[PDB]
Subunit: 337 residues, 4 copies
């Protein structure tokens, strides 16, 4: 029996947030910092919950040192060496509280990560990523990492439904990475037919996490600050971004109209440059992106957009955005000429 | 609890007006003038209820002097000086009954407006505009302007839902400006995720105004005369337009294929040229538009379109259009080659 | 009260015809000729019910002489003179049974038509066209033409709903022309907001005609032979076409890549060349179309397509197509690369 | 009575497959081979159920010799001669178990096929194709072929609904070819208005076959490996492909940016090169396609995609994919820049 779910699954383009009444005079009143206490690691975090994705070109140390100035976060890419990290530590000690070390489920990866966590005790976040986030093999791996590092906060993914968000949390992960399909350079939908609309995946997964006192990252699929806001509005605790951060000076890669090469974690460009075949669910794209320059401007644009959103729905802090969010269903997002 | 309204919100593209039986021989029979009596100012107005928007390039004095010849209206941009206005008065006294002076919620703006209303008693309309039309701060500001000018008619905005249309009317505004998102150079949807489909916003807001014996302007989102007609058909008492009036000789700005620069009230181009950051809900676009020449032709095209609409639905006067309007839901608006 | 009909109105793109079981070996078995007896004129017609539209460039005498060889029909454009027609009669007497003379509702038009019907008794069809097919003025005009020519068959239009199809038939018209909006060079939707999806307009109007033993033409909106088939399948008794016949050698106008100018009946190009302002509901477009050459090939393509349709649904004659038509609702019509 | 089925018929773009929990470590665990026993021929087949379509350019002997190395299948085009086939047999004896000989319903075709089956007893599949797969003439032809070759497995088509799938199976065909409209170079929808969405046609037809212990091919409409997976997920026993195999070295036709000419079975290019008028339901297109080079890479890409799909839904073998398939309804398939 092949069956078809009756419920149309919407994405970001299919909706808008409705404005509401409030006493908020203007957007600089709004506080975008959140304070979280994690279910399993028992650690506490405070910052602006926007994470740079652990992709080759954007999850760099340079990107980190800027984000951190804004209390934002960076999931560092897994190809840096131990020596690379010990220089990062020496150079930017104040940044270590705002980064996560990354690993796949392979033994070599686990060992290298371990050497990093031991050499840099200030790093207190771990980001774990596989091709099939629904595998029992990932479940037992998450148990292993939890046992090895009982006081480190664990981000794990990726999934799109709530049964697997609960199983991953109950198996020791703190923050589940929700998203398969929508990523700017993800090709699961084309290559495999498998995936989920981003908005629907957050609505559905956020509820499942929060009943366990766990948390989620909306990973992928945001194309402008409005999407970030919708992602938060849908219940996401953090939002992670690759494509919106691609193209800047603090991105790794030469400038080539000035452009830069933006490529997926499991892309052909990636496999050539490195053992990444089964790191993500699809062999992602390799695109050319216009050179945007310094990431500060982009950060300002994004945070500013999000402050307005909160103001316009009556949220004085980011914590209250999902509480105040009413989405309306629309037939369009743009007025063309 | 993030929730999603079950009702799909349609816009202008999603519908058509149905023709109906009548005794109307032709479109020159139709009278497009309306006579209004305002709830709070208690003043009476007669004209063709189509308003040029208070944008830098289109809300000019030159635009005004043409519109006025057609009994149309112009919301003048807020950057003109007192001296500029006193020349407008001297030069085009017969036009003063067909313009509104504009202001934001800042004290400097209020003072400059006040000096203008005192120096030109013939100006009897006020247009008030903010970034967050749902703020309690806007509500109290509207009370202040009402108290300062008890015999001036007040347009205030912008909103998209009826609870705020009622609160603004009950707080002293006469005519509520309805529209957030659809404007040709508005970027709220992209930058903030917040907005509303224009047609749905008028249907919903018109009902709310009219129960209080108040009035609304459909502000933004019309791309052709058909949209104007639909806007009126949905219940709007006036319709305001920026983009359809952009590009003409009576527009402010040099001619540059001949083009002209059309930019938003809170756009980057605006901030550079002037203190406009929080005048509108978004930092609007700056587009190039083809030089259309004299606004008379455009006016003729638009009024002509609207006369046909009334004829085809059986409305001998514009007053009867919403009464006679049945919208049908469609899957398209164009026959491509 | 502005209201919105709950029923989504589909067009040709939104549907497909379902194949069905039959004993039909192949498409040359299918007979596309119909025999009609008209309600009010009491005349009988036999032919392939596909009519060339009465547009300047396609409703020519040259087009007629080809169509007629295929038992197809031509609604001749209203600008030809009496002398022009008397040469047509002399030259192509066998074609006169397959054409209609055209007129608007003006007295000059009526007189010129009258002179034509008197000078050419073999012409037994009249085509009457106005801007507002819902006007009481059109209703009384139809009564007048019926009384003046009691044995001529009258095509009248255009409408999209059944209440007006019945009133026009009961007022003496034989064949109602159904379609407002979808025409290739019609601009009602853009200029006035008024119109109707073609498929929905035929479904709805065909039922209304046939209960009175009257007939309809699906006028406008077909872009390929599939649309013709759907139009017939929806219940239409005839289908009229402009754009699909545009571009051929037998079209009026010079060749200019080789192109030809195709323009609407009430278009600016039309008004310049001639008193046509209120002949159709909109001031239609003027497009450039590629030179297709001889209309024979196009005719062959269209008739062939329609024979296959009948075969694939089990209709041995065109009469049985609507009887055998089941439409399925689809989300697309094309497989792009 | 023209009527409209209430059920919207979805295609591949309208859905995604949902990931599910499993114990599958990775995609090389998945077995894509199936073992089938046919209802009427009583023969058994084992291989990867992906068939190259019997089109001029892709159903070649060269294509066959590669496919066969991958346990894939090739429906050979019907224009090869007896002598051509006897060389194929001599050269690639091990491939004969993985090809089908093709024929239309004409006597010449039947005779030539017969001479081939007699000269090459190793060929045990027959592929039969007509313009109207719903004709009683096709039904009796299928009876004739069954009687002539009682131990050959018969693929017959094409249809889209289950009443005709059952009648063709009960009349002796083994494997019904399901698909009319979606094919990359099919024009039925444009030329005739007749067709069916591919996904809906498989869902509906698969059920009908399987109740008779028969089988179906999803013929046409796949544009990437995701579509293949969805096709299998919907219940299809095999999937046939033309366009995805077009463009390779083992395709027939010269290289011309390097391109190759890809044309339909009943296309104008086909009729010119050969008696094919009524072989398929439409006169298909002739497109230019980029030269992809060797078909091995494409095969690897497609099989790899399909292994991931099975892994991500928890299917260790292709047999279990439809059993494990839950489709979700979506509003999009792509993230544009
Ligand atoms: N399946 C797949 N996902 C990728 C690949 N590269 C990056 N991603 C995903 O894309 C996400 C970011 O999405 P974006 O913000 O660019 O839309 C990353 O966090 C990661 O989840 C890849 O090669 N394959
Ligand atoms: N949010 C926003 N709205 C603008 C800006 N500039 C103009 N608008 C809106 O656009 C309206 C006109 O819309 P239009 O007729 O061009 O679609 C104006 O009345 C105003 O409400 C801007 O910079 N930001
Ligand atoms: N409203 C309007 N309709 C036109 C005009 N010119 C042609 N048409 C319509 O277009 C029809 C043919 O549509 P087509 O087959 O090109 O889609 C004609 O029969 C007529 O009803 C025009 O200028 N204005
Ligand atoms: N109606 C029609 N179908 C064709 C023609 N040529 C190929 N096809 C269909 O297209 C199918 C392959 O579809 P594709 O994989 O290219 O989308 C073939 O198996 C066949 O069923 C043609 O000329 N007319
Ligand atoms: Na491991
Ligand atoms: Na980059
Ligand atoms: Na103030
Ligand atoms: Na302008
Ligand atoms: Na008259
Ligand atoms: Na023409
Ligand atoms: Na035969
Ligand atoms: Na090819």
């Amino acid at each position: 029996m092949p069956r078809i779910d009756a419920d149309l699954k919407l994405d970001f383009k299919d909706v808008l947030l409705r404005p509401k009444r409030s006493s908020l005079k203007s957007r600089a009143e709004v506080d975008l910092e959140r304070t979280f206490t994690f279910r399993n690691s028992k650690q506490t975090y405070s910052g602006i919950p926007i994470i740079v994705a652990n992709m080759d070109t954007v999850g760099t140390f340079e990107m980190a040192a800027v984000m951190s100035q804004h209390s934002m976060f960076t999931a560092i890419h897994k190809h840096y060496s131990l020596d690379d990290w010990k220089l990062f530590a020496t150079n930017h000690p104040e940044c270590l509280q705002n980064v996560a070390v990354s690993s796949g489920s392979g033994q070599n990866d686990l060992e290298k990560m371990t050497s990093i966590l031991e050499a840099v005790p200030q790093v207190k976040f771990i980001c774990l990523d596989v091709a099939n986030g629904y595998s029992e093999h990932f479940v037992e791996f998450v148990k292993l990492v939890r046992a090895k590092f009982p006081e480190h906060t664990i981000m794990a993914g990726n999934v799109v439904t709530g049964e697997m968000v609960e199983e991953l949390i109950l198996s020791g992960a703190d923050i589940i990475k929700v998203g398969v399909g929508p990523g700017s350079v993800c090709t699961t939908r084309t290559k495999t037919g498998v995936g989920y609309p981003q908005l629907s995946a957050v609505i559905e997964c956020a509820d499942s996490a929060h009943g366990l006192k766990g948390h989620i990252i909306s990973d992928g699929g945001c194309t402008c600050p409005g999407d970030v806001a919708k992602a938060f509005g849908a219940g996401a605790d953090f939002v992670m971004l690759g494509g919106m951060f691609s193209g800047h000076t603090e991105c790794a890669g030469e400038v080539i109209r000035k452009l830069k090469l933006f490529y997926g974690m499991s892309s052909d460009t990636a496999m050539n440059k490195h053992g990444v075949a089964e790191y993500r669910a699809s062999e992602g794209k390799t695109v050319e992106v216009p050179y945007k320059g310094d990431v500060e401007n982009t950060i300002l644009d994004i945070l500013g957009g999000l402050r307005s959103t909160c103001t316009y729905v009556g949220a004085a802090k980011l914590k209250e955005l999902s509480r105040r969010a009413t989405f309306i269903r629309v037939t369009q997002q743009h007025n063309t000429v």
